């Protein structure tokens, strides 16, 4: 669920998602259209595609089992959909962590008046 994805984001990026990624670019925030603005935004679009392959549960409310070990995020569910959502979140958090070096605060609250380019496609 998103509280959990926020925890993975805290561990990998050091940021509180609700004051950063949650309002970022065209895909991390309230967007879902236009061009992904940078590598951080592309991580979120890739997560949207990963979620699109999940149907049995809603990624937003799928409360999964995960742990942090050996520098990795380990998804431990036996329930297939919870595991799938956790794997999407793990990949996205890792991706975001790899790109905080280019995190640009100017993309916060960006969706409101931008994101009119040709949209990304899965």
């Amino acid at each position: 669920n998103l509280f959990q994805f926020g925890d993975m984001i805290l561990q990998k990026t050091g940021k509180e998602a609700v004051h950063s990624y949650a309002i970022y670019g065209c895909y991390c925030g309230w967007g879902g259209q236009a061009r992904a603005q940078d590598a951080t935004d592309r991580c979120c679009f890739a997560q949207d595609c990963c979620y699109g392959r999940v149907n049995d549960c809603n990624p937003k409310t799928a409360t999964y089992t995960y742990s942090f070990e050996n520098g990795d995020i380990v998804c431990g569910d036996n329930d297939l959909c919870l595991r799938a959502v956790c794997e999407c979140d793990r990949a996205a958090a890792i991706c975001l962590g790899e790109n905080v070096n280019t995190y640009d605060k100017n993309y916060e609250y960006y969706s409101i008046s931008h994101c009119t380019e040709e949209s990304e496609q899965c």
């Binding site: 509280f3 949650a22 065209c26 809603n58 409310t61 799928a62 609250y109 949209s119 899965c122």
Partner: protein, 122 residues
């Protein structure tokens, strides 16, 4: 998509209203577990359940047809899953409007520790 849901929210409640739903209660925005705290939070829970019933496409990326007609959100000539997604968003935006005067600022940015109740069922 969320860009459109944001437009519905701001068109119904006023400019910048969408940012009040980035993280509120246990279900609005970055949450997803526990029991809805109040009417606004329930609007979000119902919206999550609504998205979870959509099969055929991705609520985060789907671009549907809609417009405001004399202040009222009207879902346009959508086919299949797009109809459903637009309806989820329309109902939730109207729900946020109906309950705007019960919005509790003390429910913004809650930690998951406030949502450790047996998650409600759709």
């Amino acid at each position: 998509n969320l860009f459109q849901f944001a437009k519905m929210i701001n068109g119904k409640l006023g400019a910048f209203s969408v940012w009040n739903y980035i993280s509120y209660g246990c279900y609005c925005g970055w949450g997803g577990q526990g029991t809805p705290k109040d009417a606004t939070d329930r609007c979000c829970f119902v919206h999550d359940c609504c998205y979870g019933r959509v099969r055929g496409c991705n609520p985060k990326l789907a671009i549907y047809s809609y417009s405001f007609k004399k202040g009222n959100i009207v879902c346009g000539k959508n086919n299949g899953c797009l109809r459903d997604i637009c309806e989820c968003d329309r109902v939730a935006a109207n729900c946020f409007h109906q309950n705007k005067n019960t919005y509790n600022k003390n429910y913004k940015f809650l930690s998951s520790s406030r949502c450790r109740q047996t998650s409600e069922q759709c």
